[PDB]
């Protein structure tokens, strides 16, 4: 797993939860990482289509729109 | 921002990108954090509906299904 867990617990607390179990932190970290990989994989193909090896903010933005 | 940037660059690299700019890292970190907050905010309401103050893995799982 690339994402660390404590920042994910802080996101849930910032939305208002009073208490958070470890299992909820780990599960939301796993789902964000999965979404992250699917968006990155589409952004890579977009950058390739524009003649680039470098992924830029516009490739990510266009890939998130292409999930609908 | 709660999410740190370096782990987000590692997700994009693990999907195969050869190079990643800082702007792409920052933008994907911002979009995951936004998705995280929307899922956490729905999970809080679900936990409340089940008589709990503690957010559990099942509330997160049901909230991700409820975005469709």
- Domain ranges for chain B, please list them: 2-68
CA proximity to A53, closest of B18, B62, B49: B18
**Run of H or E including B19:** strand B19-20
- Residue B45, min C-alpha distance to chain A (Å): 9
Resolution in angstroms, to 1 decimal, for this deposition? 2.0
Determine the Cα–Cα distance for residues A39 and B5; give it in Å rounded to an integer: 16
Contact A29, A5 (CB under 8 A): yes
Return the number of other C-beta atoms located less than 10 Å from residue A1's C-beta.
10
Is the domain spanning B2-68 CATH 1.10.20.10? The answer is yes
A interface toward B at CB cutoff 8 Å? 2-4, 7-8, 10-12, 14-21, 23-24, 26-28, 31-33, 35-37, 39-41, 43-44, 47, 53-57, 59-61, 64
Question: Rounded to a whole number, what is the distance in angstroms from the first to the last CA of chain A?
Answer: 26
Residues 6+ apart with CB under 8 A from B43: A12, A17, A24, B55, B59, B60, B62, B63
Query: Could you tell me if A37 and B11 are in contact, meaning their C-beta atoms sit under 8 angstroms apart?
Result: yes
Burial A45-67, CB ≥16 within 10 A → b, else e: ebbeeeeeeebbbebbbbbbeee
């Amino acid at each position: 797993m690339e994402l660390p867990i404590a920042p994910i617990g802080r996101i849930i607390k910032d939305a208002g939860a009073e208490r958070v179990s470890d299992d909820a932190r780990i599960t939301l970290a796993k789902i964000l990482e999965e979404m992250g990989r699917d968006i990155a994989s589409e952004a890579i193909k977009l950058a390739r289509h524009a003649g680039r090896k470098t992924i830029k903010a516009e490739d990510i933005e266009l890939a998130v729109r292409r999930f609908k």
